[PDB]
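Hello,

I think I submitted the chloride ion job twice by accident. Can you confirm which output corresponds to this input? Input:
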Amino acid sequence: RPTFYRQELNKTIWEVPERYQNLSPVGSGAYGSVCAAFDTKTGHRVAVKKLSRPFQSIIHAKRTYRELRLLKHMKHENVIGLLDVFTPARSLEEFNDVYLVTHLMGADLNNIVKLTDDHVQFLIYQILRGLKYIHSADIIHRDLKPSNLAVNEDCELKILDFGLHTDDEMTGYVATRWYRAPEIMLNWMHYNQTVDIWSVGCIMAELLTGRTLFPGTDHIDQLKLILRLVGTPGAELLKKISSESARNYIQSLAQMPKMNFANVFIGANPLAVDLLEKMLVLDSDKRITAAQALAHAYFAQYHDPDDEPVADPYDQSFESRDLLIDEWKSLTYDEVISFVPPP
Ligand SMILES: N#CCC(=O)N1CCC(Cc2ccccc2)CC1
Ligand SMILES: [Cl-]
Ligand SMILES: [Cl-]
Ligand SMILES: [Cl-]
Ligand SMILES: [Cl-]
Ligand SMILES: [Cl-]
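Support: Only one job matched these inputs. Its output is below.
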């Protein structure tokens, strides 16, 4: 057990191992209770997150367990990883607080982009390499957007802030909805991992143009912008929409054909236009997969099929389990004390 020390940072007690020095808050509350520190063991600048109210409800205790399980699994260059997890508690009986540690990441895709074709090739390659890994473990991100992509001075990228979202959060003229696949925005059907590829298309279009692709003022305005570009649905997709009311609403709209993407993305690399056509497909069954997109000619400069790794299998059977607060808290304690740090 390391030696812990205490200090108060912006109205908050922090009790952390001596290896972590120079704790200074970051985000102005945007990231939660998150400090920058220097890690004397590894020499890395790190981010330390102190969870708020981790066991306050069944919902909150399960969410804490879910976050720790996902962060302990993800071991990939293009995905957030866990450098450490700790508690000052010496037993289950006195366990209350959880702290998570990762690489300090001060800039997101907006900070760098709010870009040449080469920059777009490399940034989208890295998102797709990370997603091939995530999808191979049957994990769905569900919230890819520029603020959830960390980028450094060498244009190296990591995916963070996995979907673990409020009705009010998704209402009106908001970036929280602009990157969402239509089938999840309007609850058309059971969604799967293809929702993430729609988001990658939206991000790639905005890196090429400098403009949000579907900046809707509300859910309905946003669906009109999407159908103007990709076309109204055919009979085959309408059959897959499980809500009769959602089906009836779509059939009230005047039919529109798919637009010519070379006349929308004027001057772009033809290979970029072709890849956008394969991502931004309304029927999720017909979208290009991450593994297929890595092999597209647009990424010929970067693609190496011997350096695009898959994940170990990920058991999420807990998601269907009904437990008490103290059962979720005990499972979380076991995962803190069993953590093994990376080499
Ligand atoms: N500067 C700044 C921001 C910053 O460094 N990042 C964004 C906030 C997350 C918070 C976090 C910490 C540990 C485990 C999961 C998530 C990570 C780091
Ligand atoms: Cl220490
Ligand atoms: Cl990381
Ligand atoms: Cl504690
Ligand atoms: Cl964003
Ligand atoms: Cl597992």
